[PDB]
Amino acid sequence: MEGTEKKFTFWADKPGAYWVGEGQKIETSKATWVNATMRAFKLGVILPVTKEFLNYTYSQFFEEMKPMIAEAFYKKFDEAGILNQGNNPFGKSIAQSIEKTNKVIKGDFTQDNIIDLEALLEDDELEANAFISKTQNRSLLRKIVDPETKERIYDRNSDSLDGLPVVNLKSSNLKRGELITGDFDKLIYGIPQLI
Amino acid sequence: KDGTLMNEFTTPILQEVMENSKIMQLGKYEPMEGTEKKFTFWADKPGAYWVGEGQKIETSKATWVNATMRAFKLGVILPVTKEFLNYTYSQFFEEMKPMIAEAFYKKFDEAGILNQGNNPFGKSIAQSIEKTNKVIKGDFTQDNIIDLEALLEDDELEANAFISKTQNRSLLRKIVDPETKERIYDRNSDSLDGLPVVNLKSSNLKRGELITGDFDKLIYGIPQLIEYKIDETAQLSTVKNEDGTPVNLFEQDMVALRATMHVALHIADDKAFAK
Amino acid sequence: MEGTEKKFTFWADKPGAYWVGEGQKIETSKATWVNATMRAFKLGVILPVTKEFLNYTYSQFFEEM
Amino acid sequence: KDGTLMNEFTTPILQEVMENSKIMQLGKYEPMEGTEKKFTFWADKPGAYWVGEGQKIETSKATWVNATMRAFKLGVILPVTKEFLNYTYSQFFEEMKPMIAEAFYKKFDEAGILNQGNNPFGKSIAQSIEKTNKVIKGDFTQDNIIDLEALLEDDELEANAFISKTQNRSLLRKIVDPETKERIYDRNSDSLDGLPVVNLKSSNLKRGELITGDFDKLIYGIPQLIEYKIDETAQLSTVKNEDGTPVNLFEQDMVALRATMHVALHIADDKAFAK
């Protein structure tokens, strides 16, 4: 998409009485905001420019580097939206929680607080599939002192905090605390247009 | 807006409404005008080699309560002008009828299980309050949860799945206890006693858990009438308010359905009490 | 399409002496809202409708009306 | 920026009138740069048995002019964002090129006949009329128009049709001739005396018609060029304000087509008197 597409209609429905018939209607729409941007490399690219023109192997390596930079482009956009708030988009993951309402705290760490965080999510009524966590944060989350342990997995494929499988991604974030992702729309146009 | 639309917007939450309709099942589903009579028990025992004696038991259920569907107020009147002028809004209204049909099953299941806003007498919470109490939502304890299972064994009642709201499930998931047994959680769904159960959206308190045994389901169909009658009792806010006389125009489609639930002998329900 | 839609475009004139290419194009849009509804029959046609059911000559007059 | 979509662009029945006026003038075109004049006027003796005076005058006049169409900046900046989103803007650019070509012929006529621009400078019809002083003061009468047309034919070459400036033609139509005949009335085509009059829009000219026959008109070719690299900034708004035009492809294509015109002095024109 060129911008942001409008969300699907909710429309609440209930049976109620046998004779009476009433149905609620709800409308949702999203406005177009924020666009992706890619900048050319400085200092390092200038050294590679002379090598690619003279040698054939360096020119082929530069084409292979374009594919590596394309993977880094998706990694940079995801890390900024989830942590430190360095993205163009307003109200996302950490920025959305800080503006509206706080759910969890990274300052205080407790085994009972982790179970209490799941109870707060049940009252808020939000469904989560996978929780995004950095490599540095995952090492601290793996080992913890507690009287009783429930839902961790670890040995199978990935370590679980509440009781669900999640993949770890490399991002600049603090070791203390864990973040969870709900629902977010993804948009892509392509990779490398100008040579 | 003043009755103007440039582009049609897609409706939010579709899977949640469909899940609530499938969740309301315990003792089969069959098409009937009222309530069908139950199957005969007839107790049989071997006893002696020469002597032969057999007990006979008869069961029957009387026809009571019928399903009712009402047309939408205020919101449907705004949509009536849009559907007549624009082709996209008219197609959206037909898609909304299918969404309201899923909400019809969700409204009937929530009223029977919680708050007692159903036409039927003696169901889930209403049946437990009238006959005998099994569980309490006022007091919460890990030992009491194990004690509730022991009380069900003495009562002799079989349960497949326990119906629980989204707000109640969040409180039930996290609990402080010295020893934990039968929870699952990571596989598909969290278990309270040791059995798989699907969660449905219903207006209920966070404290306490309810269990379903056996209940009969009845259905006639969805959306019969398309043309809407003149509004007088229903409140209108958009464009013009109606109280007495109204112009003949379709705003919300009328649905015809019939539902009757069979009364259960034993059912587990929790009620909150102040200390 | 519902309502009314109108589009207008204007082009800017370029300089005589060659130095720099001048752009800037003007765009205008016009739209009209609210459509008039046709009036329904009242007591005047209602008196004729009763005669149309009984008499054959009055039945043809209702179609002509 | 680029919020609501209009999906409409102005085309034809405006540029066609300006193109027809330039074609109605009729002038010889040459591919080679520069011009040349012919030798005129020679002295002759009347005296008997004597050589007398004997001198012949030679004339040579070169003509060369370069013309270029100006590219948009203010309107072109808004169009750049629309071009990437909508395919209609690319088709609109082809229609805009025809309008710019029509404006190119209009600017060449306004500089000579109306003296608005400095394209021709030396060889101008309005400048030649001011130097000769053949223009009539005040409002043009029906009897005065015939006298002015007869005066031009006696001194110089007779013109086929007088140039119209839209508003001047309407005032001439209201006036009636002394004889039993309609003056400046158009049944199918508008004509001053015999030949069809050409209508042209001018900012400087408002009242008074000028009659000209012999006029040179030469063109290099068609005005079409590819757009690359941003040049000449006036107004730009998208994300950040900029003083000098840089980065990306050009917003508007600048067309180059050289045009040259030579005047033989035949126009008289008319000007209104002020008190």
Author numbering:
A (entry chain A): 66 to 260
B (entry chain A), D (entry chain D): 35 to 309
C (entry chain B): 66 to 130
Copy text verbatim from the article accompanying this structure deposition.
80α is a typical example of a staphylococcal transducing phage, capable of transferring non-specific chromosomal or plasmid DNA at low frequency. The capsids are assembled from a major capsid protein (CP) as empty precursor procapsids into which the DNA is packaged through the portal by the phage terminase. Many SaPIs, such as SaPI1, redirect the 80α capsid assembly pathway to form capsids that are smaller than the normal phage capsids and that are thus incapable of packaging full-length phage genomes. Here, we report the structures of a mature 80α capsid made from an uncleavable version of CP at 5.2 Å resolution and of a wildtype SaPI1 mature capsid at 8.4 Å resolution.
The structure of the DNA-filled SaPI1 mature capsid was determined to 8.4 Å resolution using AUTO3DEM from 6471 particles picked from these images. The SaPI1 mature capsid displayed the expected T = 4 icosahedral architecture comprised of A5 pentamers and (BCD)2 hexamers located on fivefold and twofold symmetry axes, respectively. CP subunits A–D derived from the 80α CPFA model were placed into the SaPI1 density by rigid body fitting, followed by real-space refinement in Coot. Density for the N-arm was apparent, demonstrating that the extended conformation seen in the CPFA capsid was not due to the lack of CP cleavage. The distribution of CP subunits within hexamers, however, is dramatically different in the 80α and SaPI1 capsids. In the SaPI1 capsid, CP subunits on opposite sides of the hexamer are >11 Å further apart than in 80α, leaving a larger hole in the middle of the hexamer, and the hexamer has a distinct bend of ≈10° relative to 80α. These differences presumably reflect the different environments of the hexamers in the T = 7 and T = 4 capsids. In the T = 7 80α capsids, the hexamers are located on the flat face of the icosahedron, whereas in the T = 4 SaPI1 capsids, they sit on the twofold axis at the edges between faces. In the T = 4 SaPI1 shell, there is no rippling of hexamers around the threefold axis, and the dihedral angles α and β are identical to those observed in the procapsid. In this case, the distinctly different environment of the hexamer on the twofold axis is accommodated by changes in the hexamer itself.
